[PDB]
Short mmCIF file of C-alpha atoms and ligand atoms in Angstrom, two decimals:
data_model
loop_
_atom_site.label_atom_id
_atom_site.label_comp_id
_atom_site.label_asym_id
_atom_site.label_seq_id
_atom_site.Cartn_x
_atom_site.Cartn_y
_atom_site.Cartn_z
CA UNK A 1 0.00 0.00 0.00
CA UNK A 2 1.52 3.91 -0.83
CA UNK A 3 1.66 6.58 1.30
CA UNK A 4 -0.47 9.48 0.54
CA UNK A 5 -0.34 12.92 1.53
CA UNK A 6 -3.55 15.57 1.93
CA UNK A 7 -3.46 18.92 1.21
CA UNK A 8 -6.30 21.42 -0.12
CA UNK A 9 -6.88 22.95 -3.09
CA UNK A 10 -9.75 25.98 -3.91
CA UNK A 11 -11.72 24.88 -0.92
CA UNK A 12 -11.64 20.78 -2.38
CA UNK A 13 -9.21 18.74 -0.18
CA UNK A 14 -6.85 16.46 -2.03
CA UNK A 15 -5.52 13.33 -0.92
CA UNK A 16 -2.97 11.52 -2.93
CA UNK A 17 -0.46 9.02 -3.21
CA UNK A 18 2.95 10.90 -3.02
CA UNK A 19 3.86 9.35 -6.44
CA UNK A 20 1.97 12.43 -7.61
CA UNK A 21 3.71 15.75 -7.13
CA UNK A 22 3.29 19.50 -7.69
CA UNK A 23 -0.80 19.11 -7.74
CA UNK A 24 -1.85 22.02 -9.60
CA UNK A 25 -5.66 23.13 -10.58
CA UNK A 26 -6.90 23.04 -14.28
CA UNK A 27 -10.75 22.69 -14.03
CA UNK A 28 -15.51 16.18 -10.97
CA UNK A 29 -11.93 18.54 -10.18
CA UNK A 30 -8.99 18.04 -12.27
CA UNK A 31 -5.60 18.75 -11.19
CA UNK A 32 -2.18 18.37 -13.44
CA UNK A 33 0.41 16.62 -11.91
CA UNK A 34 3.84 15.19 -11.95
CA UNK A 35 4.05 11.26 -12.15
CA UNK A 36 6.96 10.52 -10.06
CA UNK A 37 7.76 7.53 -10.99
CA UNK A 38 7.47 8.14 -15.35
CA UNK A 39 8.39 11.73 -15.61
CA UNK A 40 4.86 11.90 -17.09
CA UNK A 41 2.43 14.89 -16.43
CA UNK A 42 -1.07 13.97 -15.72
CA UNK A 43 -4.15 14.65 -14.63
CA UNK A 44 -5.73 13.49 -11.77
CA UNK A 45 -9.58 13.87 -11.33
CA UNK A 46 -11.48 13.94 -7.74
CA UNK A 47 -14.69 12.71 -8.50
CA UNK A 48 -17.04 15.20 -7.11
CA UNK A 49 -19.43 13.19 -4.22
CA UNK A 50 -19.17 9.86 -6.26
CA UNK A 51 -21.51 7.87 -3.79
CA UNK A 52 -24.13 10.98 -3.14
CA UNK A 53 -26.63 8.93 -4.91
CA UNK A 54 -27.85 6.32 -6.65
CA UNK A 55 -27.84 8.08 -9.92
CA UNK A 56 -23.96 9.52 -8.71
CA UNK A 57 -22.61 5.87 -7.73
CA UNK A 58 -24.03 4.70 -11.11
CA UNK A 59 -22.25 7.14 -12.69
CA UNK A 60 -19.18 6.67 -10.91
CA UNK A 61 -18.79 3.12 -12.06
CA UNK A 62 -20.07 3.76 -15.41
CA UNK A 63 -17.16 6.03 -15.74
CA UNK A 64 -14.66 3.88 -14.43
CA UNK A 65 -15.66 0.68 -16.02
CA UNK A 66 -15.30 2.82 -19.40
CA UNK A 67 -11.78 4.09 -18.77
CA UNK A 68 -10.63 0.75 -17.90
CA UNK A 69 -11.69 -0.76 -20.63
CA UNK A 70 -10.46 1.88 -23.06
CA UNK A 71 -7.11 0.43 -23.83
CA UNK A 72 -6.19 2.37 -27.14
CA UNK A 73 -3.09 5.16 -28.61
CA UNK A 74 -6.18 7.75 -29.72
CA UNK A 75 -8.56 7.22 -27.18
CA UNK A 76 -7.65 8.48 -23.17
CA UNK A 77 -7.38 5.84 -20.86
CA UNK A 78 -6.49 5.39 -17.12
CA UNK A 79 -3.26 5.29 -15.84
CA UNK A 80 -4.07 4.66 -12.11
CA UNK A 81 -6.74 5.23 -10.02
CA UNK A 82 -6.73 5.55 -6.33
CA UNK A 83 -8.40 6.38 -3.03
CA UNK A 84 -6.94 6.80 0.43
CA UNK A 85 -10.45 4.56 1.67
CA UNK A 86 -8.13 1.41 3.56
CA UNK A 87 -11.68 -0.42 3.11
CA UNK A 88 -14.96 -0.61 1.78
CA UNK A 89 -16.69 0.91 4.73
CA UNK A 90 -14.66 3.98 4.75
CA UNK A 91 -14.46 3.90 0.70
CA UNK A 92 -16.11 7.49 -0.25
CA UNK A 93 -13.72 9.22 -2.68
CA UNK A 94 -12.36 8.41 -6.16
CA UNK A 95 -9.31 9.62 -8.44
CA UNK A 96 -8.53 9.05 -11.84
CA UNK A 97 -5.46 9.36 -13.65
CA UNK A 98 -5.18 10.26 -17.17
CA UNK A 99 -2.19 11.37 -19.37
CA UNK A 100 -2.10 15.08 -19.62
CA UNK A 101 -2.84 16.48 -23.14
CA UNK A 102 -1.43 19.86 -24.13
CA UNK A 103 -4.48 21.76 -25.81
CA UNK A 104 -7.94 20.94 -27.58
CA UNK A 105 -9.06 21.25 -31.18
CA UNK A 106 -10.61 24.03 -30.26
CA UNK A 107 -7.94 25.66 -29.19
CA UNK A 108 -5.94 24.97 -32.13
CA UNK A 109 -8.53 25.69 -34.51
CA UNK A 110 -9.32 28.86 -32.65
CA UNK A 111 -5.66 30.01 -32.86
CA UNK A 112 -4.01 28.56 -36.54
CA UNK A 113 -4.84 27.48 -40.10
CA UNK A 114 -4.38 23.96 -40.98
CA UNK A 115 -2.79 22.83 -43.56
CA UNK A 116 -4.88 19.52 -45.35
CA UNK A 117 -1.88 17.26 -44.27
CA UNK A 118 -2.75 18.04 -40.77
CA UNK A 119 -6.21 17.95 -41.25
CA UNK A 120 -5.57 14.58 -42.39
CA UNK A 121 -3.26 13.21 -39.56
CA UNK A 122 -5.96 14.78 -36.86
CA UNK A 123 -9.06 13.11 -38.43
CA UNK A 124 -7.49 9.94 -39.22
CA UNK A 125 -6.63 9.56 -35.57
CA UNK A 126 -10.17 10.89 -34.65
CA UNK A 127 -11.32 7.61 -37.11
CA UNK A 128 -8.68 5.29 -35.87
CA UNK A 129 -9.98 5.54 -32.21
CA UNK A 130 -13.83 5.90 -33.77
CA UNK A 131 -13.54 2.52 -34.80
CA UNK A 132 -12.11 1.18 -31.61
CA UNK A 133 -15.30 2.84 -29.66
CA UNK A 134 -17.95 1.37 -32.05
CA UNK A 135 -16.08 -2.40 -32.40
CA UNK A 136 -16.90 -2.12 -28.55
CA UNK A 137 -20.28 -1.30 -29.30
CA UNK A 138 -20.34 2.23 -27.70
CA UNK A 139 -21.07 5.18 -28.86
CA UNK A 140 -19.77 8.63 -27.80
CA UNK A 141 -22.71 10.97 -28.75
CA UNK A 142 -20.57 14.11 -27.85
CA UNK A 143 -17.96 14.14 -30.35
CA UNK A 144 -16.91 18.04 -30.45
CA UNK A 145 -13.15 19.84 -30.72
CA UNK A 146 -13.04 20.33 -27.27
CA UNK A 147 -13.59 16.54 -26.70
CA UNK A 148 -10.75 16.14 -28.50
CA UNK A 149 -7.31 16.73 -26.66
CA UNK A 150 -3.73 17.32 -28.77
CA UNK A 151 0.20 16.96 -27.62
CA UNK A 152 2.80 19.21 -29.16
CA UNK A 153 3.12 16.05 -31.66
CA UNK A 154 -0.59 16.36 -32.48
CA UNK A 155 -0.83 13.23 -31.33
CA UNK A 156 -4.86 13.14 -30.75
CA UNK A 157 -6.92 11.33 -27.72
CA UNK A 158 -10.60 10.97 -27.94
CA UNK A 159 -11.98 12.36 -24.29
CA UNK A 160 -15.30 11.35 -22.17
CA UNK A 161 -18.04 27.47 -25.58
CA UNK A 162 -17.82 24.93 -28.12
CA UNK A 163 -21.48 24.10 -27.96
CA UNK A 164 -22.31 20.53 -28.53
CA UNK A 165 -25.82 20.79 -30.81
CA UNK A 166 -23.63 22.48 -33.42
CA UNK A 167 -21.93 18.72 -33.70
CA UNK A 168 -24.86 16.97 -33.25
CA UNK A 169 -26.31 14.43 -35.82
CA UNK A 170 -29.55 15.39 -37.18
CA UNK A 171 -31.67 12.17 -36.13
CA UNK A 172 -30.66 13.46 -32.17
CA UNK A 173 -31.67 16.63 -32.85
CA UNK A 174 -35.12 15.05 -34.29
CA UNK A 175 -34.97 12.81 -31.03
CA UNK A 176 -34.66 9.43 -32.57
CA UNK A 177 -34.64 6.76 -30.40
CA UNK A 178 -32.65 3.96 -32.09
CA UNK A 179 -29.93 6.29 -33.72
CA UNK A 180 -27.00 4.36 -34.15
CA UNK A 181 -23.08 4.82 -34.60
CA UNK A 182 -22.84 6.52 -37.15
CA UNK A 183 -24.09 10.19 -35.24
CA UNK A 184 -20.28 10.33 -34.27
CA UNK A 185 -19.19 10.49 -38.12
CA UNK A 186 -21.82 13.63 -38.55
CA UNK A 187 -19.78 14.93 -36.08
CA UNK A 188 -16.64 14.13 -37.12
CA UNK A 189 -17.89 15.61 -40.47
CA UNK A 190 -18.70 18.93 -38.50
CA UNK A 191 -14.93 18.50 -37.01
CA UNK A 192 -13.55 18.11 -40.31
CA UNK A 193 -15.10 21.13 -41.80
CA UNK A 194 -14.06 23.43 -39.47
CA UNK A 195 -10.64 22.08 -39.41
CA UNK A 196 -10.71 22.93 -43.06
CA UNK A 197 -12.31 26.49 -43.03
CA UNK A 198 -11.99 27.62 -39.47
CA UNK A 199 -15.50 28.57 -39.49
CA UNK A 200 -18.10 26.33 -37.04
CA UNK A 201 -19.67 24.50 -39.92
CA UNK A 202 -23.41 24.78 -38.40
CA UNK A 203 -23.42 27.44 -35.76
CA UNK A 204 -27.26 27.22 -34.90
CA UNK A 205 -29.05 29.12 -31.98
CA UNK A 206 -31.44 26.66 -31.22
CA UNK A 207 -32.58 23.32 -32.33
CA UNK A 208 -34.45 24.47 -35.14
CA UNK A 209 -32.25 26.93 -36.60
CA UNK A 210 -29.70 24.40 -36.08
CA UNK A 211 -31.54 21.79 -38.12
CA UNK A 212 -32.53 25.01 -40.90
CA UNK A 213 -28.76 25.42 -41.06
CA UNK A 214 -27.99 21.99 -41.57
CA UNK A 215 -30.80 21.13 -44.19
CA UNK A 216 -29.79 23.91 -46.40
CA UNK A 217 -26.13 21.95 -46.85
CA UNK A 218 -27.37 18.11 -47.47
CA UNK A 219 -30.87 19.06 -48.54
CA UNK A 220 -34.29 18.15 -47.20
CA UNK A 221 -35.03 14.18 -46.78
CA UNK A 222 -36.42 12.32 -50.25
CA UNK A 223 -39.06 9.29 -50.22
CA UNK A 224 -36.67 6.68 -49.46
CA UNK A 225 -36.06 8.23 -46.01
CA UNK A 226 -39.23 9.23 -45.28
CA UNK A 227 -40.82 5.78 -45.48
CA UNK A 228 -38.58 4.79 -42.66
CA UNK A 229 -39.88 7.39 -40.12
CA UNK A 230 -42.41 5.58 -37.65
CA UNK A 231 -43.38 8.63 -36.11
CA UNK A 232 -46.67 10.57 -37.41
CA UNK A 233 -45.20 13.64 -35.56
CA UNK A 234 -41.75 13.52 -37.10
CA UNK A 235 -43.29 12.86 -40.71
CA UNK A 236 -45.25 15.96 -40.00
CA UNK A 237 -42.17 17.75 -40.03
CA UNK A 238 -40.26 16.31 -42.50
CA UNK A 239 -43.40 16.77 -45.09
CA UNK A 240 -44.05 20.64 -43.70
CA UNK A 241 -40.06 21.84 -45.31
CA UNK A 242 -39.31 23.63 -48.36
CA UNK A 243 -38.29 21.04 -50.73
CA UNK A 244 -34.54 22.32 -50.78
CA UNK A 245 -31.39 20.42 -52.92
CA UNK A 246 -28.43 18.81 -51.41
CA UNK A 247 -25.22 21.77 -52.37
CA UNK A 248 -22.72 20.40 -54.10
CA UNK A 249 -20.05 20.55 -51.03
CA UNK A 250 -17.32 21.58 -53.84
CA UNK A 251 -19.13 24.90 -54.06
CA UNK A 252 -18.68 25.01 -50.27
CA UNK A 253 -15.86 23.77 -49.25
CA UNK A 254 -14.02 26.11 -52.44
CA UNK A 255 -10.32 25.06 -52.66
CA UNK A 256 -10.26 22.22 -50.53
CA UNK A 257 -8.63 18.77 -50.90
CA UNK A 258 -11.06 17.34 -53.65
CA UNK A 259 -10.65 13.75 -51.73
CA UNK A 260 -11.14 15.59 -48.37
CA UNK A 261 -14.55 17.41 -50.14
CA UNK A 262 -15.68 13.91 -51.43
CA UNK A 263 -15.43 12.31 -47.64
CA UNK A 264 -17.18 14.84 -45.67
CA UNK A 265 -19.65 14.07 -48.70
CA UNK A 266 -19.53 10.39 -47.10
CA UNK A 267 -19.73 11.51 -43.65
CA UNK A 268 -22.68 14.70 -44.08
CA UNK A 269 -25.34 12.53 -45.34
CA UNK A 270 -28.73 13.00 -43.92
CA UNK A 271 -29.64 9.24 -43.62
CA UNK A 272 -27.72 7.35 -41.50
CA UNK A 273 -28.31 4.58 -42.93
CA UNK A 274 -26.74 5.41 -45.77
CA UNK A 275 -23.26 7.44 -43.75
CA UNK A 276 -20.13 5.93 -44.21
CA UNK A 277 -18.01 3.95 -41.03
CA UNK A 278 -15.29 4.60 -39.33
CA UNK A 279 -13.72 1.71 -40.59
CA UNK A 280 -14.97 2.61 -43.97
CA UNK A 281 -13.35 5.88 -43.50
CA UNK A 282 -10.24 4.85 -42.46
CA UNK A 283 -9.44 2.79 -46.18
CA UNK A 284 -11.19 6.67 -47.98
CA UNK A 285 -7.97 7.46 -50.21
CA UNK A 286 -8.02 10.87 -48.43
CA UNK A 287 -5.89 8.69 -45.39
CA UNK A 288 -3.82 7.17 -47.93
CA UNK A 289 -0.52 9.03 -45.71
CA UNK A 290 -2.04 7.23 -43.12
CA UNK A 291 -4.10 3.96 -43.38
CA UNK A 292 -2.82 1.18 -42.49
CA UNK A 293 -5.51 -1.88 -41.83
CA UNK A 294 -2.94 -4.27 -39.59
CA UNK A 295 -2.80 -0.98 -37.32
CA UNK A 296 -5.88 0.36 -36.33
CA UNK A 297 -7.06 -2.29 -33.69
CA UNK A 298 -10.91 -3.29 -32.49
CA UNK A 299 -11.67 -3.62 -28.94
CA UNK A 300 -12.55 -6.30 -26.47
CA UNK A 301 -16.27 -6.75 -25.84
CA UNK A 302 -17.51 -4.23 -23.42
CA UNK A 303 -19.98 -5.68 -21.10
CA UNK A 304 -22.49 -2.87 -20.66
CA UNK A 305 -25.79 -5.06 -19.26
CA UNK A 306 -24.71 -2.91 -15.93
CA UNK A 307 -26.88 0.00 -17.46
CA UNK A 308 -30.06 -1.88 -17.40
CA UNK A 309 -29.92 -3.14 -13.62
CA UNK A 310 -31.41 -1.43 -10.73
CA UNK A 311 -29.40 -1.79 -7.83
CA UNK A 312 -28.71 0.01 -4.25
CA UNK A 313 -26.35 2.68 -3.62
CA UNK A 314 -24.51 0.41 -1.41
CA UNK A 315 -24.12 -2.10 -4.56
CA UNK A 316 -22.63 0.30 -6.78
CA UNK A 317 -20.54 1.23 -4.43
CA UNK A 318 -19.54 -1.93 -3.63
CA UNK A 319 -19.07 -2.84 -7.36
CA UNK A 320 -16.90 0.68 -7.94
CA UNK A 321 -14.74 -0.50 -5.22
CA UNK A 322 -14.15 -3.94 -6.93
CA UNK A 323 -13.11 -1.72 -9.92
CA UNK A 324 -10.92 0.26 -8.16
CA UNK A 325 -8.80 -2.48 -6.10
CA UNK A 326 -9.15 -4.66 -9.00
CA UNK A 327 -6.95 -1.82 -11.45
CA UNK A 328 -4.08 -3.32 -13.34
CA UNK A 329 -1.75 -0.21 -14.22
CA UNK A 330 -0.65 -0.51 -18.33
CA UNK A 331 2.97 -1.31 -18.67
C1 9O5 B 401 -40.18 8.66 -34.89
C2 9O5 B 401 -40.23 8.30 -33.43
C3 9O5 B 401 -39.03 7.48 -32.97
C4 9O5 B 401 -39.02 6.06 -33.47
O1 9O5 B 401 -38.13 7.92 -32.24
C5 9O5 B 401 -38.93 9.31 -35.27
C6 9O5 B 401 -38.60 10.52 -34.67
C7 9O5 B 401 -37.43 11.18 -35.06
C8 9O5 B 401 -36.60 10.68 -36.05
C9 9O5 B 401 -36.93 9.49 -36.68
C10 9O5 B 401 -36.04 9.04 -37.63
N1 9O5 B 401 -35.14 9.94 -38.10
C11 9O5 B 401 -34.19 9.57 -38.96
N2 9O5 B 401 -33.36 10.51 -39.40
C12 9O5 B 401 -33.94 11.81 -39.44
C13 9O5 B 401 -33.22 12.64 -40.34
C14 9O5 B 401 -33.77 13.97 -40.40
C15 9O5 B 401 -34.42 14.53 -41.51
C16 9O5 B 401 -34.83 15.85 -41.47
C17 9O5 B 401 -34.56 16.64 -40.37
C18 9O5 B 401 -33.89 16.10 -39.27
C19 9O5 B 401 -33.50 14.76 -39.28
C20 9O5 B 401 -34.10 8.26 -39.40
C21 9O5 B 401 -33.15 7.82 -40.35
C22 9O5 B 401 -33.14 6.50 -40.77
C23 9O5 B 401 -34.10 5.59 -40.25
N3 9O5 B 401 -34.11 4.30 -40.62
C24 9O5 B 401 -35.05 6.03 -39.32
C25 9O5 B 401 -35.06 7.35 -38.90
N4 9O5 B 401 -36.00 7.76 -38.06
C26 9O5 B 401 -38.08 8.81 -36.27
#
């Protein structure tokens, strides 16, 4: 067992083994640190009143269950986690450990024009961890540049204002209830574009200017989407719109990459059902620099049948604690 030290930190007391050093507030609370014993700096997160509730202890092992399992070069995974609880019954705090990124698309976008290469390298990696998510059968549902954390190397990490509806696919916006993977490629699409323009691609100020923004890129939805909408109410919509044309994204995107215009094509289609993969991505001949099929790795089944059980807050608790005693740090 380490030795830990306490000390507090904007009102938040932090307790710590002393592998970590020089704690020092970024934003549960997140702290950078210095990893003793790899040089590395990292961030360590204090989850804020993880066993409050039922829906907080849920939470708290839905989170770490994910971050264990996330074992993967563009996607952020645990290095450690901790508590100073010596058993169950005084187990009431948990910290994370993650590597510490430098900066977020959104920072970079916000501050320097990309050059296609790099717009390349940053949404391959976006892709290459994409497809690692969905083999696991999850789906992120918040895909947005400030999701999306960058070292000096722009080496890129999938994580967990920059408001999220403006990446959001269009069947969540219309409230779908069995949208599938493929909402993360609209927003990698949205990504993409902006990387490429610096300009938010669909900057809406509420859900329906959001969706009037985004219908006059693809157009509105033909026949052959329309008789697979169950809903009366949603149908009702749909058949209210000014019949309006897909654009022709090379009169939008003027000057870009023609294999980079011809993949957001791929990616910014209004039926999901018909919007490419991230595997399917990853082989586009826009990654050509890039792809390489004996490299971009699928993930272990991720047992998720957690989410539909009801339990105590004592059991998830209990179950959270497993996690955290159970933690095998990567090599
Ligand atoms: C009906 C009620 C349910 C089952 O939730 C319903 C509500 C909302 C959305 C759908 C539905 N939407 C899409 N994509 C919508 C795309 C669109 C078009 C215009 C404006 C915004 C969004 C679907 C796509 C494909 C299939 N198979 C089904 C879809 N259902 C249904």
């Amino acid at each position: 067992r380490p030795t830990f030290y306490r000390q507090e930190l904007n009102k938040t007391i932090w307790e710590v083994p002393e592998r970590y050093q020089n704690l020092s507030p970024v934003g549960g609370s997140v702290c950078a640190a210095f990893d003793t014993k790899t040089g590395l700096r990292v961030a360590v997160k204090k989850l804020s009143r993880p066993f409050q509730s039922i829906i907080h202890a849920k939470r708290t092992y839905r989170e770490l269950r994910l971050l264990k399992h996330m074992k993967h070069e563009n996607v952020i995974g645990l290095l450690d986690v901790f508590t100073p609880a010596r058993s169950l019954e005084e187990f009431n705090d948990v910290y994370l450990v993650t590597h510490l990124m430098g900066a977020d698309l959104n920072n970079i976008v916000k501050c320097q024009k990309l050059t296609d290469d790099h717009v390349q390298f940053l949404i391959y990696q976006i892709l290459r961890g994409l497809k690692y998510i969905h083999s696991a059968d999850i789906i992120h549902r918040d895909l947005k540049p400030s999701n999306l954390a960058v070292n000096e190397d722009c080496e890129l990490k999938i994580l967990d204002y920059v408001a999220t509806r403006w990446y959001r696919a269009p069947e969540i916006m219309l409230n779908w209830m069995h949208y599938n993977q493929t909402v993360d490629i609209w927003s990698v699409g949205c990504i993409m574009a902006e990387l490429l323009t610096g300009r938010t691609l669909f900057p809406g100020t509420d859900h329906i200017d959001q969706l009037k923004l985004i219908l006059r890129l693809v157009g509105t939805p033909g026949a052959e989407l329309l008789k697979k909408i169950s809903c009366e109410s949603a149908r009702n919509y749909i058949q209210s719109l000014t019949q309006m044309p897909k654009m022709n994204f090379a009169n939008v995107f003027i000057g870009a990459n023609p294999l980079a215009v011809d993949l957001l094509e791929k990616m910014l289609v209004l039926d999901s059902d018909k919007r490419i993969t991230a595997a399917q991505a990853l082989a586009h001949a826009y990654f050509a620099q890039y792809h390489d099929p004996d490299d971009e790795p699928v993930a272990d089944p991720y047992d998720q049948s957690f989410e539909s059980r009801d339990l105590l807050i004592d059991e998830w608790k209990s179950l959270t604690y497993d996690e955290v005693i159970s933690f095998v740090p990567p090599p």
